[PDB]
Amino acid sequence: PVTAGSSSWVDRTVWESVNGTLQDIINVFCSGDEAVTFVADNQQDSDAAD
């Protein structure tokens, strides 16, 4: 805000960009009923994955 008469307005592109990305990140990772689901390559140890 260099001068009172300079009309010290400020842009918030940074704020909009972060919120736009966040609107999707939580919508993908923290949107489902759970977070992760372990899966095994065989069944006889899949009793541990669940």
Partner 1 sequence: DTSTILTIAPELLLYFTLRHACLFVQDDNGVQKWSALGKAILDEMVEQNKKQEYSGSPIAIPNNMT
Which residues in the 8-37 window bind partner 1 by CB under 8 A?
A: 8
Q: Which stretch binds partner 1 (CB under 8 A): 4-12, 13-21, 29-37, 42-50?
A: 4-12
What DSSP element (H or E) covers 21? Answer: helix 13-28
> Applying CB under 8 A, does 7 fall inside the site for partner 1?
yes
Q: Give the nearest distance from C-beta 11 to partner 1 in angstroms.
A: 16
Look up residue 46 and give its two tokens: 């899949």
DSSP 1: -
Indicate the residue among 5 and 20 with the shorter CB distance to partner 1. 5
User: If you search the block for the tokens 């993908």, which residue do you land on?
Assistant: 28
